[PDB]
Amino acid sequence: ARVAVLISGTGSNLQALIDSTREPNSSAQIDIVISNKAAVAGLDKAERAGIPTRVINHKLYKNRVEFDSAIDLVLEEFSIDIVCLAGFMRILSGPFVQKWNGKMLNIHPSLLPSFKGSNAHEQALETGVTVTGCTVHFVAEDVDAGQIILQEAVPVKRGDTVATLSERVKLAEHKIFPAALQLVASGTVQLGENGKICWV
Ligand SMILES: Nc1nc2[nH]c(CCCc3csc(C(=O)N[C@@H](CCC(=O)O)C(=O)O)c3)cc2c(=O)[nH]1
Numbered sequence: 001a002r003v004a005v006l007i008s009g010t011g012s013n014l015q016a017l018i019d020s021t022r023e024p025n026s027s028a029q030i031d032i033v034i035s036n037k038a039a040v041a042g043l044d045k046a047e048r049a050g051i052p053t054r055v056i057n058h059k060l061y062k063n064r065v066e067f068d069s070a071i072d073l074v075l076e077e078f079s080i081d082i083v084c085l086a087g088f089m090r091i092l093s094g095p096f097v098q099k100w101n102g103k104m105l106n107i108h109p110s111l112l113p114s115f116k117g118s119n120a121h122e123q124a125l126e127t128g129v130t131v132t133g134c135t136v137h138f139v140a141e142d143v144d145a146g147q148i149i150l151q152e153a154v155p156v157k158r159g160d161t162v163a164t165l166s167e168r169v170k171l172a173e174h175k176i177f178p179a180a181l182q183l184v185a186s187g188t189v190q191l192g193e194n195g196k197i198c199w200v
């Protein structure tokens with residue numbers, strides 16, 4: 001299966017996916033990396049791995065639909081089967097999500113359904129949980145609400161900050177995102193017609 005990875009920043013999840021998808025038994029190959037932001041470290045990681053990159057600046061578009069259409073054009077150019085959102089921070093439009101239904105995965109740094117949104121660690125710390133984690137899910141129109149594929153719990157230590165908690169949770173993200181991508185790319189897991197996850 002042919003994979004696009006979308007990023008907005010550092011690209012540690014991208015690197016873990018590069019490493020995993022290059023193992024001999026990988027059912028996935030990363031054929032394009034798309035960033036909506038120029039000059040981020042994830043682009044450097046892609047270039048070092050010899051993977052083509054595109055920068056599609058969302059600020060140059062009138063609305064989400066036009067921006068998403070520009071992404072979609074590149075996905076078609078590279079005959080992409082599966083899209084991974086890996087630190088990509090844009091909310092996607094309904095029609096784009098529907099087109100890629102069952103074919104687009106996101107990593108989120110909480111145990112969904114807790115702490116949806118852009119600042120999950122801030123929320124986890126404010127709430128005072130002692131267990132947080134990360135989630136890979138299929139992308140549905142409602143943000144951070146699509147069907148869950150894998151999760152991993154991560155402890156919160158007393159005195160944690162966003163810096164220390166996010167570091168600990170990323171170790172788990174780098175485990176479950178590659179595992180989830182392999183499950184979907186191999187056809188082991190799919191989004192069922194009834195809208196629920198199906199393990200073949
Ligand atoms: N339809 C849909 N889109 C999605 N995008 C992402 C991946 C991102 C999930 C995400 C969580 S909060 C947020 C957000 O507020 N984005 C802002 C930009 C904020 C910033 O620049 O930091 C926006 O897009 O206006 C983005 C996941 C996902 C999803 O499940 N459904």
Ligand SMILES: NCC(=O)N[C@@H]1O[C@H](COP(=O)([O-])[O-])[C@@H](O)[C@H]1O
Binds near residue numbers: 014107
């Ligand atoms: N709303 C999505 C979200 O918060 N994503 C989170 O952004 C970070 C990106 O790190 P990376 O660029 O090093 O992969 C990761 O922690 C990811 O789960």
